[PDB]
């Protein structure tokens, strides 16, 4: 079949992709170096820096949340099982590290038919680690739109129209808003996200970001992981 030396053409990848509008996203699915960064200037303006958000106080409570995940502060919806019909390409999930979830039947069994059977699903249901699986996940809509689930994210309190829901490490804004409590996806801090192959695709405005080796702890254990920051 079609081969580009790897990372996305495996029996367990849901290749249910509709580029009827001819918006070139299939080139990105097939070449990791291909991204579409048009419209990134506008989109980034709506994303806010952490200082502009209200400070947080009291206990932290969990929250349930929109349409675009490009911002570090997007409040993901908690993960569930999604039908393979609605996914194009690989689905990446973040331990904090990048890990790939493949197509399965409704009972966790591995299925090898490129998400073509209607039984085929992506079971992305999450409990935060260490006693769990991953903090969040990110894939592509069958029509080329990035989709992120994760959490449940964090309410840190605060008052105003500037109040913040933390899906990352927000220790400045609240000392208990640490990734191990509040992480809900690939955003390690407000300024950094986990580096994986289809990151230029899923998050195309991180293209000028620089890659660093970063170090973090989850529940007192250490992960050394490459991530992109700017």
């Amino acid at each position, epitope marked *: 079949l079609i081969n580009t030396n790897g990372s996305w053409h495996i029996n367990r990848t849901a290749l249910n992709c509709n580029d009827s509008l001819h918006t070139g996203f299939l080139a990105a699915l097939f070449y990791t170096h291909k991204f579409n960064a048009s419209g990134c200037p506008e989109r980034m303006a709506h994303c806010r820096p952490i200082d502009e958000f209200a400070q947080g106080w009291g206990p932290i409570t969990y929250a349930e949340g929109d349409q675009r995940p490009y911002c570090w502060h997007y409040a993901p919806r908690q993960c569930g099982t999604i039908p393979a019909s609605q996914v194009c390409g690989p689905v990446y999930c973040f331990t904090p590290s990048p890990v790939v979830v493949g197509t399965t039947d409704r009972f966790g069994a591995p299925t090898y038919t490129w998400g073509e059977n209607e039984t085929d699903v992506l079971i992305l249901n999450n409990t935060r680690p260490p006693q769990g699986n991953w903090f969040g996940c990110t894939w592509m809509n069958s029509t080329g739109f990035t989709k992120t689930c994760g959490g449940p994210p964090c309410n840190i309190g605060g008052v105003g129209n500037n109040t913040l829901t933390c899906p990352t490490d927000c220790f400045r804004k609240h000392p208990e808003a640490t990734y191990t409590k509040c992480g809900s996806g690939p955003w390690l801090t407000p300024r950094c996200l986990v580096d994986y192959p289809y990151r230029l695709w899923h998050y195309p405005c991180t*293209v000028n970001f*620089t890659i660093f080796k970063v170090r973090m702890y989850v529940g007192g254990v250490e992960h050394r992981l490459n991530a992109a920051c700017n």
Partner: antibody
Amino acid sequence: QVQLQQWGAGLLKPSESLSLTCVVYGGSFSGYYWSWIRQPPGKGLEWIGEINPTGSTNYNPSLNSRVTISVDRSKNHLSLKLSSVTAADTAVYFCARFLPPDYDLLTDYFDPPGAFDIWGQGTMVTVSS
Amino acid sequence: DIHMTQSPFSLSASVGDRVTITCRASQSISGWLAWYQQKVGNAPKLLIYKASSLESGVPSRFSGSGSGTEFTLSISSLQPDDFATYYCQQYNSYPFTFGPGTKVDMKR
């Protein structure tokens, strides 16, 4: 994973221009620092220059502003251009990637990079009139 | 520009020898020194960065110590895989400059 496949050159003559490419296999070009280094034959290493993740370049003044480094994001390509070539410029040319800087998440600070961890096998440029 | 020198130019060793070679700098380069190995016809390999930190996949035989104007690379027990020309590089200032190399060869 990341590899550097380097593409060769032809015979050059002085006053000509040189253009050499290197294609990043194993991963994208993004987020990395890339540099060009040359070794005259029998001699040792000289740093031609660098490109930062957002396109900005730094060049060695010993090239007398006759050198250009670039990245073609459309084809995953790293290029080196050297105008007004002289027989002095006969050397092996290497593409290398900077070692990813260490980043402290809390301080949001890192050392700016200068070590080359992946190197392309290098390719000869002979320049004689 | 910062001038990098090395001693010795040529060292003749045998397996099991501890080899120590020094790099020196015209101006203080702090810790921003890297050490590379190059075997003939092949590309340079990174061994040390930050003058003490060892890049992954290179063995513990290789040690780096130094600061300011003087730095040093050492093999605790040379092995046949360790005969090459060894180079130092500052990344303190632009232009990034290299040392002229130290060749370690077989002893007979």
